[PDB]
Homo-oligomer: A and B are copies of this chain.
Amino acid sequence: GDDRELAILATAENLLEDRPLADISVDDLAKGAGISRPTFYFYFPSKEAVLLTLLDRVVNQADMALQTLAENPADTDRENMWRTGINVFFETFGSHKAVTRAGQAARATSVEVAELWSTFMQKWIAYTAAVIDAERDRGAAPRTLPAHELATALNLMNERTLFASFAGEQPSVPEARVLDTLVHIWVTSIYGE
């Protein structure tokens, strides 16, 4: 029961490694999960709902990890504290590249996918802007741009740059260099006069 659901999600994630959602049928997902077509419909209304569930699981994983770090500050310097947050994405989405690719292709057409990602980005941009505000109040950062506008651009940069790196787009920063590249831009733009 919870078994068949997990097998349907595992099948979709496996299949999305080789082709887009448009080339996967409900019959392919059911066949991979060892169930019939109408049994599939008991668990999901459509192959699009399977993708949404996979995206919801990955986004909550990242969010829970970031909550853990926000509750458990590392005894390290400021550059390494920003690095630890960025690395959540690097590690969580970078462990589910096919799902990430499929979430981005769906965003153009799917209101549900676009809304799910927006809700989460609003949260992480708010947390970012709150940290920057805290750092300015402590005298560690200068009051330059509005913190919430700076946080919005830096989080958008990381969304698009990690995507390109994970995809091997041309142009992209190589995946083994992208964390240091992003952390440089965050620390200079937040602490730089």
Say yes or no for A157: interface residue by CB 8 A criterion: yes
A10-67 interface with B by 8 A CB criterion: none
A148-193 interface with B by 8 A CB criterion: 149-150, 152-157, 159-161, 164, 169-174, 177-178, 180-182, 184-185, 188-189, 192
Contact of A153 among B161, B169, B170 (CB under 8 A): B161
Contact of A177 among B104, B121, B144, B149 (CB under 8 A): B149
Say yes or no for A105: interface residue by CB 8 A criterion: yes
Assembled-state Cα–Cα distance A171/B181 (Å): 23
Known: A108-B108, A159-B160, A192-B192. A185 touches B154 (CB 8 A): yes
Task: Decide: B150 and A181 in contact? CB cutoff 8 A.
Answer: yes
CB contacts (< 8 Å) of A192 on chain B: these are 188-189, 192
Interface residues of A: mostly helix, strand, loop or mixed? helix
Known: A105-B108, A189-B189, A192-B188. A153 touches B181 (CB 8 A): yes
CB contacts (< 8 Å) of A178 on chain B: these are 153
Say yes or no for A9: interface residue by CB 8 A criterion: no
Q: How large is the interface on A (under 10, 10 to 19, 20 to 34, 35 or more residues)?
A: 35 or more
The list of the 6 closest CB pairs from A to B, nearest first, reads A188-B192, A157-B157, A160-B160, A192-B192, A105-B108, A185-B189
CB pairs A–B below 8 angstroms (7 shown): A118-B171, A152-B172, A152-B181, A155-B171, A156-B172, A157-B185, A188-B188
